[PDB]
Amino acid sequence: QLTPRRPYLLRAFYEWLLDNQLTPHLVVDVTLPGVQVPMEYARDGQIVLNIAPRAVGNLELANDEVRFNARFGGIPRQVSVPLAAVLAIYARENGAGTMFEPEAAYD
């Protein structure tokens, strides 16, 4: 019935971490269909992405997915992660943040 809360909570924590001058990172489950990340960078089903302004271009924290351009090694890559695959958002410097709880819409 009601849409997922996750994307709203994601944007909220993203803003909160940046407003405290921290570096937001996402923990993503790379096994979900639709995940588009450089798999060489994934390990044991997950990958960590730096989404701070400094490390990304054209960042979109939409309700359906997180999208952005970033550099992996010496190569620019485009990333696309379905919200269902976003497990958590944490500050690289101190672990401040949250692990998202499951929701009906996400199967």
Partner: peptide, 15 residues
Amino acid sequence: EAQPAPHQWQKMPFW
């Protein structure tokens, strides 16, 4: 800034 390699992100505080 470049994205973290596994050996870098596996060392972060949220593990």
